[PDB]
Amino acid sequence: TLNGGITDMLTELANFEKNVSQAIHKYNAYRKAASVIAKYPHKIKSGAEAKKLPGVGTKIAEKIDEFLATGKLRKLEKIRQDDTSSSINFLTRVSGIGPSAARKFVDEGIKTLEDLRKNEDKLNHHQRIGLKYFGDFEKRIPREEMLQMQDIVLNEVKKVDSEYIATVCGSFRRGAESSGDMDVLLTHPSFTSESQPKLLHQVVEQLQKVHFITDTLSKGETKFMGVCQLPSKNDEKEYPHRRIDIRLIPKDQYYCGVLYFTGSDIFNKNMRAHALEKGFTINEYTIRPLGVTGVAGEPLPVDSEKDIFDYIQWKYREPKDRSE
DNA sequence: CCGACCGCGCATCAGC
DNA sequence: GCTGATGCGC
DNA sequence: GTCGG
Numbered sequence: 001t002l003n004g005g006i007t008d009m010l011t012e013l014a015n016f017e018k019n020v021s022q023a024i025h026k027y028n029a030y031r032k033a034a035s036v037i038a039k040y041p042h043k044i045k046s047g048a049e050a051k052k053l054p055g056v057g058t059k060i061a062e063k064i065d066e067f068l069a070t071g072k073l074r075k076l077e078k079i080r081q082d083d084t085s086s087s088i089n090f091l092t093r094v095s096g097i098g099p100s101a102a103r104k105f106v107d108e109g110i111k112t113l114e115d116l117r118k119n120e121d122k123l124n125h126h127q128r129i130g131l132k133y134f135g136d137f138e139k140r141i142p143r144e145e146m147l148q149m150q151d152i153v154l155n156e157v158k159k160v161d162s163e164y165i166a167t168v169c170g171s172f173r174r175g176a177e178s179s180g181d182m183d184v185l186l187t188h189p190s191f192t193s194e195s196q197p198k199l200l201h202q203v204v205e206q207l208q209k210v211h212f213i214t215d216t217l218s219k220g221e222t223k224f225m226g227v228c229q230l231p232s233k234n235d236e237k238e239y240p241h242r243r244i245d246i247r248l249i250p251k252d253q254y255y256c257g258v259l260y261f262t263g264s265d266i267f268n269k270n271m272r273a274h275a276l277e278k279g280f281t282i283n284e285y286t287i288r289p290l291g292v293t294g295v296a297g298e299p300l301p302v303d304s305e306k307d308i309f310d311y312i313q314w315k316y317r318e319p320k321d322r323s324e
Numbered sequence: 325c326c327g328a329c330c331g332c333g334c335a336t337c338a339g340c
Numbered sequence: 341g342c343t344g345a346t347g348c349g350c
Numbered sequence: 351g352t353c354g355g
């Protein structure tokens with residue numbers, strides 16, 4: 001919490017730009033600034049000092065000097081006191097309510113969870129589920145629970161067909177102590193770029209059959225987004241409901257997918273910048289060679305995460321060591 | 325100065 | 341009925 | 351809002 005007041009302020013400004021101004025690039029600018037400042041190992045003494053960090057520019061340096069001298073930001077103070085902005089900001093915490101729906105709801109006097117619960121007819125299916133689990137979806141997931149969730153998913157997937165490959169990615173695969181949701185990448189040897197039906201559906205159905213998956217936000221042939229819950233013992237309290245995504249990826253793009261969806265964002269960026277310096281380009285699907293004039297060639301064969309590191313002559317980085 | 329800032333799968337809607 | 345645009349999440 | 355061409 002060296003500069004926790006500054007990072008809190010920048011995050012509040014970010015959330016305002018995202019939810020109220022509908023300016024996703026300023027949201028990400030403020031987020032970027034807050035991240036580098038949370039990494040900085042000194043209590044910032046001036047805006048000029050922070051401005052030396054990448055992502056901190058002139059207007060953020062100005063806000064830091066105001067916050068340092070006064071302990072507050074009058075832009076934020078006015079925003080907090082604006083009832084419309086505060087209601088729009090709150091409503092976007094419902095999964096499925098974005099800035100457009102939030103503003104539309106607030107315009108017609110729908111401002112609170114109660115107002116939403118009163119107006120289920122004006123909600124689409126996703127929004128109804130987000131409202132249903134409003135508190136649960138904002139809880140984090142302890143790693144011990146993730147581990148238990150991974151066991152169910154891998155086991156039920158194996159039960160459908162032994163040849164499925166399922167990998168839990170995101171912050172969990174990087175070894176985090178808690179996760180926000182569960183990210184599952186699924187493949188099968190029979191599904192390639194140049195190619196069985198219902199491959200995702202059968203896994204989703206089996207997980208519903210054992211009452212692990214409890215709700216569906218969206219589902220198609222390659223991506224499922226829904227809700228799941230660990231089973232409870234007959235004497236203890238039930239578990240929170242959890243967000244879970246399952247994506248079906250072709251096997252020849254699978255390990256590029258695992259690489260991408262493990263992250264982190266900073267690590268992917270560093271790994272792709274290094275790939276370029278070696279004459280390769282990595283995206284979420286493929287690694288391709290670069291010709292002399294920057295033309296990408298055909299995708300290279302990838303049987304594992306390690307193959308990707310080998311191509312660019314990088315020693316394998318363990319998922320836990322991929323924070324950057 | 326000024327354009328880019330990831331962009332795609334799914335759900336939903338406006339227009340044909 | 342269809343297609344393309346958009347909101348949303350990530 | 352920040353960055354870079």
Ligand SMILES: Nc1nc(C[C@H]2C[C@H](O)[C@@H](COP(=O)(O)OP(=O)(O)OP(=O)(O)O)O2)c(NC=O)c(=O)[nH]1
Pocket residue numbers: 169170171172178179180181183245260261262263264265268350
């Ligand atoms: N789960 C998920 N992630 C991404 C983004 C990629 C790049 C990112 O470094 C990596 C993990 O991002 P994610 O939002 O899952 O964050 P994570 O590190 O898992 O933290 P948390 O979810 O809070 O536990 O996946 C997606 N694609 C685009 O954003 C996606 O559809 N689903």
Ligand SMILES: [Ca+2]
Pocket residue numbers: 170171180181182183
């Ligand atoms: Ca995640």
Ligand SMILES: [Ca+2]
Pocket residue numbers: 136239240241
């Ligand atoms: Ca609950």
Ligand SMILES: [Ca+2]
Pocket residue numbers: 284330331332
């Ligand atoms: Ca993408």
Ligand code: NA
Pocket residue numbers: 091092093094095096097098
């Ligand atoms: Na939302």
Ligand code: NA
Pocket residue numbers: 180181
């Ligand atoms: Na997330």
